[PDB]
Design an enzyme around this catalytic site. Structure first.
Site, PDB file in Angstrom:
ATOM      1  CB  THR C  11      -0.939  -0.048   1.241  1.00 37.93           C
ATOM      2  OG1 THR C  11      -1.812   1.053   1.099  1.00 37.93           O
ATOM      3  CG2 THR C  11      -0.254   0.070   2.567  1.00 37.93           C
ATOM      4  CB  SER C  80      -3.938  -0.957   2.720  1.00 43.00           C
ATOM      5  OG  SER C  80      -4.370  -0.077   3.695  1.00 43.00           O
ATOM      6  CG  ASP C 208      -7.964  -3.526   9.412  1.00 42.48           C
ATOM      7  OD1 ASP C 208      -7.647  -2.387   9.734  1.00 42.48           O
ATOM      8  OD2 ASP C 208      -7.701  -3.949   8.294  1.00 42.48           O
ATOM      9  CG  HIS C 236      -4.380  -2.640   8.060  1.00 38.34           C
ATOM     10  ND1 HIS C 236      -5.385  -2.731   7.202  1.00 38.34           N
ATOM     11  CD2 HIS C 236      -3.447  -1.798   7.480  1.00 38.34           C
ATOM     12  CE1 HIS C 236      -5.121  -1.982   6.161  1.00 38.34           C
ATOM     13  NE2 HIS C 236      -3.960  -1.425   6.337  1.00 38.34           N
ATOM     14  CE  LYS C 237       0.681  -2.550   7.197  1.00 36.34           C
ATOM     15  NZ  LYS C 237       0.364  -2.123   5.844  1.00 36.34           N
TER      16      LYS C 237
END
Lengths: 262, 258, 258, 262
Positions: C11, C80, C208, C236-237
């Site tokens: 992203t 993302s 997330d 999120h990762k």
């Protein structure tokens, strides 16, 4: 009986690979006559910062013209002069801004019609002059997946076919500022035809010389037969770049167009 | 008569195009001529905001010279600010250079910083009239000032005596430019072994309306060249107004420095 | 088991490096993996101020795909904002793409403009906390807003559950980035024939902390994917916190879209 | 009897081609102990925006270190930890900022002296390990005409000689962020020797493993003999990247250096 002389606003439009710089002799000559002159670089041409690989159609390529015509004051009208491939820029512009166009002047130019595909006169040009000598070709893939062919015009083709009779300073200039170009011919093939109400209604003047070594007499004459210009002016001598080899003649012809169409 | 390979270097904001009359003239005498666009000049695709110093701006010259075949030597001719490109280039490739020719140009020296003659020029000609200025921050944090040369300045000071077609071309292809003066102020001085050992010929006219007579005379006295040729008349763009004259001087430089 | 060639797309502000744990995992299963840096991201030498649109930013992906040997197909996985790179790429090379996988990612559609899900994301998550913003004007005059992601946002919202070594790496190599949102707002919508025909798999986690549950659920409902895989936990990762899980889902995508 | 424990400010300096990122495991480990840690990218390394071809000497390459030390508050002192080629960065810095340096720690590093040319330990390294396997080399000409050799480290050399025992994630990371580098060895040869008053006076701790597959036991031992470190700590096992394969051991050794030199 009653004689008329008119001053006009000419918008000079270069062909692909070239820029506003090819009008550097005709623009002061027209201004000597008191006309107003605008010479625009099209996307990825002259010193325009965009690269041809970021451009996706001949319409996108024409953005500088359409933006300039969007910007014209109410009631102002211009004569668009386009050399070589720029008759396509005049047809695109006329279908958006017919109102703003006093006349389109085709200067050893492609003369689109409304009856056939926008790519039609390009196909005919290529049948007439299929060998572009030392020109190199490249491709890129555009925003919807079309493959676009671009070219870097060869120096021999430049010397003998486009700038045949021009000064060595003018020919060296060309080599110093020439850019890649594209006809976007396959996306033109997929394009809606030029309209009758827009482009079909514009006054159209065709200037040409039979000594043009790249838009050849048989092609030029076929175009005039295919779509009758309101007036035709044939210049004796010169070469494809009549705005360099016949700058004053071309400026006197353009005065006559101002007098007739304002 | 010796025939030489001349590498012609335009000034900031301009491009190889200003040499369009001088390149065929030289080639009429059998010389080889290379006219290069510097970074973000002429039709080079880079924009000025991505160039971070005057040495990065000189990259097309240095790459050319880097690639010159072993044993070939060139005469680099530079106009206006391009004397700084000659000095940058002479420091890196002294053995590839037969002579530097300065055409109404800055003539840097070895004793003061690289921006010394730029300070002097600006002292001499401080008002750039309708020129506009802009700034960006380069990748190490320095503020770089760019300019867009003004058309009155272009008409009266640079292209004073040029043809209307020439002045009009100039407006059609002029680009933004930068002296990177503050980065030149921080730069190591030009070396004696490189730039300092090069043969140097200075061409000028006292009719130049932007590198004025006393500034050009100051330069000659500050760092005496091997030869000074003064052209009568013309304007700052002698390669446009005195083209055959410059070609004739450049022939004497080829004869002398082979 | 089919082995596939996966093209992993980071992203904005990040680089190929975020896939450093996922690339060996995939290769342990016999897959070929290409992890690319987008313009001005990771160690790409370009600076963000010279990129003028999100399509120019996608250039390393498009050049890669342009060069893929005839007849090879890839599965592009994007995290993302990289769902926008998948759509740009699918419009130009639909026949080279076996499937697009969205990893806690924007899922653009064909019906609204290219910036629609970015507007929606920002509505959903409007405060980017300690992130700093900057602007430059691109070559056609548009003002482009860039950001430097804030370390608290990096720690709590992006890398929520990541190892300290991972968070620390992130700070060591994070770059500026731009959504070019206003240029996306002016961009032609994604086509039905290209992006619209691609197989689409959406991987996410409700844990997330920046692409929040109701925004990701909104996306699924706005443009229903072929398959949705929800991972429990992580952050999120997911390619860092649930690496083997993503590798296992990516194996099911290879099996299904070969 | 009286026992002492100290918290220190470590400045971690990567080798050429690498960046601050190789310290991503040792920096949180040191901070767990309460130390302050700064990890800097040198010019044209990590994500530093400069390109190696714009850099003209190992001293210019070291600018980020010297700038950071110029910036330190009065009375603050740091322990500079440098891996592989960074003992040269410590020697350069110590001849400008001896005052600010509590100790230099050489971590499987080049150990310059003051008696021989700055390039001396590089020449000795190359006699010891002359084949850089799949590494590619390039050159450019610097600002005074010196030709500078740069390299892109080969992936096999990376896998077997530098990252021998590291994780696959750590090895893949390396491949994802590795940059070109240069020793500037010929400009180092022309450089003034490191001074006794600066670099010669700094405390010097040498950490190394005999399992290093690129700075080999014979080279490392020659360096220790050539210029006696104030202390030597040999780590058992690991590989060249001890800050990745022995992160906690290295952090405990670095605590002992803080306790002894602050």
């Amino acid at each position: 009986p009653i004689s008329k002389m008119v001053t006009a606003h000419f918008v000079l439009i270069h062909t692909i690979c070239h820029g506003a710089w090819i009008w550097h002799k005709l623009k002061p000559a027209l201004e000597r006559a008191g006309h107003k002159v605008t010479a625009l670089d099209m996307a990825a041409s002259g010193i325009d910062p965009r690269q041809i690989e970021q451009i996706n159609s001949f319409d996108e390529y024409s953005e500088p013209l359409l933006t300039f015509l969007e910007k014209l004051p109410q009631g102002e009208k211009v004569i668009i002069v386009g050399e070589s491939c720029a008759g396509l820029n005049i047809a695109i512009a006329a279908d958006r801004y017919v109102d703003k166009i006093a006349a389109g002047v085709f200067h050893n130019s492609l003369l689109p019609d409304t009856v056939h595909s926008p790519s039609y006169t390009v196909e005919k040009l290529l049948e007439s002059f299929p060998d572009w000598r030392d020109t190199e070709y490249f491709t890129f893939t555009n925003i919807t997946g079309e493959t676009i062919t671009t070219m870097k015009l060869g120096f021999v083709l430049l010397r003998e076919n486009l700038f045949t009779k021009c000064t060595d300073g003018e020919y060296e200039l060309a080599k110093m500022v020439m850019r890649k170009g594209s006809l976007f011919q396959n996306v033109l093939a997929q394009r809606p035809k030029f309209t009758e109400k827009g482009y079909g209604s514009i006054k159209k003047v065709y200037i040409w010389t039979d000594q043009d070594k790249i838009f050849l007499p048989d092609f030029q004459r076929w175009q005039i037969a295919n779509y009758k210009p309101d007036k035709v002016y044939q210049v004796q001598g010169g070469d494809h770049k009549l705005q360099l080899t016949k700058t004053e003649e071309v400026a006197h012809i353009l005065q006559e167009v101002a007098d007739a169409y304002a």
